[PDB]
Design a protein around this ligand. Sequence first.
Ligand SMILES: O=c1c2ncn([C@@H]3O[C@@H]4COP(=O)(O)O[C@H]4[C@H]3O)c2[nH]c2nc(-c3ccccc3)cn12
Length: 127
Amino acid sequence: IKHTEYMEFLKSVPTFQSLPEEILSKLADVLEETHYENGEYIIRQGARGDTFFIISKGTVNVTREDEDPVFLRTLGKGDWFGEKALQGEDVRTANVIAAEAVTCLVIDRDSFKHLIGGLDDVSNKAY
Ligand SMILES: O=c1c2ncn([C@@H]3O[C@@H]4COP(=O)(O)O[C@H]4[C@H]3O)c2[nH]c2nc(-c3ccccc3)cn12
């Protein structure tokens, strides 16, 4: 293997191919693979979060309640989410819901803050 599979996947993602491979190797060491089915909430707006997600398989819907939640966007393989709760306050600012069989590569806060949080795509993200 999985470490090699994770290496090969991360090297294919434009945000992460900017990273030194030794950093990619450390990420591949520590990331956890989680799996979702259609309709399964991955993140719930208003929860407190410490994890960053990279989609390695499937698609997800992002929604946010600003009564009912409005559809924001769909993300797929190679996209990522969960950074805002890692950028200051730890509140989740939107829901992310699986729309099918999903594999996310999940990075914890300690790994994120050292290895990912400085990436300009991530730190300068805007919606
Ligand atoms: O358009 C988006 C969006 N598209 C994807 N995502 C991802 O959903 C994740 C949910 O967890 P998180 O830890 O908050 O990180 C998030 C992002 O990665 C989005 N978030 C997101 N927040 C806003 C917002 C916030 C505060 C005030 C007004 C609008 C708009 N907005």
